[PDB]
Design a protein around this ligand. Structure first.
Ligand SMILES: Cc1ccc(CSc2nc3c(c(=O)[nH]2)CCC3)cc1
Ligand SMILES: Cc1ccc(CSc2nc3c(c(=O)[nH]2)CCC3)cc1
Ligand SMILES: [Ca+2]
Ligand SMILES: [Ca+2]
Ligand SMILES: [Zn+2]
Ligand SMILES: [Zn+2]
Ligand SMILES: [Zn+2]
Length: 166
């Protein structure tokens, strides 16, 4: 017999990403900064490294879309689903999609793109949802109002259980 084995984690530490398109809500620089910071959350505590590609295929393809946007997991307009991401693997694996019917911001207004992206990239790297309400990988979005972000211990233990520490 055969089962469907899951790729639990990337077999390589050096990963690429590409920002395929951009939300209207934030400047290009703001979007790039948010994603850069979101990846840094994970690379700061693991041997993982992330390199941005401007063209072609990257491991983590990032895009904004609304409604049905090419994977038959359609978005739902304002609120509800905010974004989703695929677990590690080839093709769609690792990819992250953000609902552009949300208002994305670099602040408390709407949904903070950095916060949501950091969470989604957790999925791209092989993390499922945490039961700890204080974790980044908790299923519900909140905003602390703080200027600095520190990755909760639960998320650190989770990602390090896959990739080891930095
Ligand atoms: C080929 C293939 C297609 C789809 C998937 C699942 S995509 C997906 N991932 C995740 C969530 C989701 O809603 N959708 C929640 C967090 C993880 C996995 C593999
Ligand atoms: C979909 C989804 C679900 C949950 C999140 C995480 S919200 C969030 N987490 C955390 C902090 C925060 O401010 N906000 C501080 C550190 C943990 C982000 C997106
Ligand atoms: Ca991919
Ligand atoms: Ca939505
Ligand atoms: Zn999608
Ligand atoms: Zn999630
Ligand atoms: Zn500060």
């Amino acid at each position: 017999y055969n089962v469907f084995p899951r790729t639990l984690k990337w077999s390589k530490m050096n990963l690429t990403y590409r920002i395929v398109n951009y939300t209207p809500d934030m400047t290009h620089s703001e979007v790039e900064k948010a994603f850069k910071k979101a990846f840094k959350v994970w690379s700061d505590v693991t041997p993982l490294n992330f390199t941005r590609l401007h063209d072609g295929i990257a491991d983590i393809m990032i895009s904004f879309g609304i409604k049905e946007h090419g994977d038959f997991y359609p978005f739902d307009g304002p609120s509800g689903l905010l974004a989703h991401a695929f677990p590690p693997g080839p093709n769609y694996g690792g990819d992250a999609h953000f609902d552009d019917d949300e208002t994305w911001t670099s602040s408390s207004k709407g949904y903070n793109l950095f916060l949501v992206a950091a969470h989604e990239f957790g999925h791209s790297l092989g993390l499922d949802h945490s039961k700890d309400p204080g974790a980044l990988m908790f299923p519900i979005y909140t905003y602390t109002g703080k200027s600095h972000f520190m990755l909760p211990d639960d998320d650190v233990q989770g990602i390090q259980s896959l990739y080891g520490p930095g």
